[PDB]
Amino acid sequence: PACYGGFDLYFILDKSGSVLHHWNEIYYFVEQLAHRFISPQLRMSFIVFSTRGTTLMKLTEDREQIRQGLEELQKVLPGGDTYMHEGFERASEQIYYENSQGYRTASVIIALTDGELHEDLFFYSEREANRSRDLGAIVYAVGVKDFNETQLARIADSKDHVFPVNDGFQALQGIIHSILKKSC
């Protein structure tokens, strides 16, 4: 698959208890990237996870829906366990559905998290992120706090795909460059 005509962005956002003082950083990354142009065929989805993984806004190219979705993200109060594997399950379900319809788009997952996962929860996040990659998704991890980059490199496609959220304006540019390289 050398290039694609359109790109679907999947934000998978950690709203567990360990990221409480950092939700604003997570929101602001998402809000800055959600506003960029990226592609003439840009759709995005907002997925949040803590005790479960929930699709807060289904894939859409409509700016008003995105705007409302950003408003629900401003309301988030972090708390609970860190079930990141369900977050990926939510994106993989939307991905498989879209390719099942006559839709050939690239899938880009952006997972924002502190990486603070017990071994079992990490074990199944890695498996579900590998499940997304078989679905053709490219996975980036945007690390929050003093994130463990060795763990995130296993969730993301590589160490190349792990960026700190604190300098993520540079990371946005880096993520968007990879989209452009793969843009027919």
Q: Scan residues 62-101 and list those touching Na ion (CB under 5 A).
A: 82
Q: Does 18 contact Na ion by CB under 5 A?
A: yes
Closer residue to Na ion in complex, CB, 86/116: 116
**Among the listed residues 4, 13, 16, 43, the single contact to Na ion using CB under 5 A:** 16
Q: How far apart are CA 72 and CA 91, in angstroms?
A: 18
Among residues 23 and 140, whose Cβ is nearest to Na ion? 23
- What x-and-dash track marks residues 144-173 binding Na ion by CB under 5 A? ------------------------------
CB closer to Na ion out of 75 and 118:
118
Distance CA 85, CA 142 (A): 16
Binding of Na ion by 125 (CB under 5 A): no
Q: Which stretch binds Na ion (CB under 5 A): 95-103, 116-124, 158-166, 167-175?
A: 116-124
The distance of Cα 18 from the centroid of its chain, to the nearest Å, equals: 18
Do the beta carbons of residue 22 and residue 114 sit within 8 Å? yes
**Does an H or E element contain 142, and which?**
strand 138-143
Q: Is 116 in the site for Na ion (CB under 5 A)?
A: yes
Closest distance of CB 145 from Na ion, Å? 9
Per residue, what are the HEC states of 19-75? Answer: HHHHHHHHHHHHHHHHCCCCCCCEEEEEEEECCCEEEEEEEECCHHHHHHHHHHHHC
Interaction site with Na ion (CB under 5 A)? 16, 18, 82, 114, 116
Residues of each annotated binding site:
16, 18, 82
